[PDB]
Copies of this chain bind each other. A is one copy, B any other.
Amino acid sequence: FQSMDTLEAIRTRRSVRAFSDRPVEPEKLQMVLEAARQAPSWANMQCSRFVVVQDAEVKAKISELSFVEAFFAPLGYRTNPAQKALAEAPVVIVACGVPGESGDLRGQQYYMTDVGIATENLMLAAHAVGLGSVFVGVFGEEQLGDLLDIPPEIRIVGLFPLGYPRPARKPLDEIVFQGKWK
């Protein structure tokens, strides 16, 4: 399939924060999630998990949870410029990690690295088929988990607005959940 040259995709990929309301073809959504699934992971343990969120009301709640209060502003983000994107995008993908399914040594959380690898696949694949996304790291984790029925032992790592800009792997259905955690 002809998407985009790898070097070109890597160079031209941008954080997209403004989305049209044009629907994402499930065929493209599948190519994006397949790319994430194809990611290398610590010992092929594949600790990444994804919740695909499409409901308007639920997306609006997620957007609210990604607000930055100046008092609690994390490093480098005085505001969260991707906040409205989480509301506007037809699809929001919530990327999580099972920490016990990746390396834990030298005080380092390799699940964070594994999810980074998988989400860079996800973002490059999306850009390659004409979609846009942005890694969102700022959000209230406990409220988000509560909203999506994500168990507290699962760690949420990033949110990915997805839409049109304005050695065997586990089955897709084992690492991607529709609407809420299963």
| Residues of A in contact with B (beta carbons under 8 Å apart) | 1-11, 13, 15, 31, 34-35, 38-40, 42-45, 72, 74-77, 101-106, 108-110, 112-117, 119-121, 123-125, 127-129, 135, 137-138, 141, 155, 157-158, 167
Q: Shortest CB–CB separation between residue A150 and chain B, in angstroms?
A: 13
Which of B39, B44, B103 sits near A137, CB closer than 8 Å? Answer: B103
Tell me if B125 and A6 are in contact (CB < 8 A).
yes
Which residue of B40, B77, B106, B123 contacts A123 across the interface (Cβ within 8 Å)?
A: B40
Contacts of A34 in B (CB 8 A): 11
Among B76, B117, B137, the residue within 8 A (CB) of A120 is B117
If A119-B117, A125-B7, A125-B10 touch, whether A72 touches B105 (CB-CB below 8 Å) is yes
Q: Tell me whether A75 and B6 are in contact in the complex, defined as CB-CB below 8 angstroms, given that A108-B112, A108-B155, A137-B110 are known contacts.
A: no
- The distance from the CB of A24 to the nearest CB of chain B, in whole angstroms, is 16
Q: Which residues on the B side are within 8 Å of A2 (C-beta)?
A: 5
A9 to B137, CA, bound (A): 27
The 7 A-B pairs at the shortest CB distance, nearest first, are namely A116-B116, A43-B76, A113-B116, A112-B112, A6-B128, A120-B120, A117-B120
Contacting pair A103 B124 (CB below 8 A): no
Query: In whole Å, how far is A116's beta carbon from the nearest beta carbon of chain B?
Result: 3
Which residue of B is nearest A47, CB measured? B75
**Cα distance A114–B137 when bound, in Å?**
11
In the complex formed, the residue of B with least CB distance to A116 is: B116
Determine the distance from Cα of A5 to Cα of B157 in the docked complex, in whole angstroms. 28
CA distance A152 to B107 in the complex (A): 13
Contact of A108 among B109, B110, B119, B135 (CB under 8 A): B109
Interchain residue pairs with CB less than 8 A apart (11): A1-B8, A6-B6, A11-B35, A74-B104, A74-B105, A103-B138, A108-B157, A112-B112, A113-B158, A116-B116, A117-B117
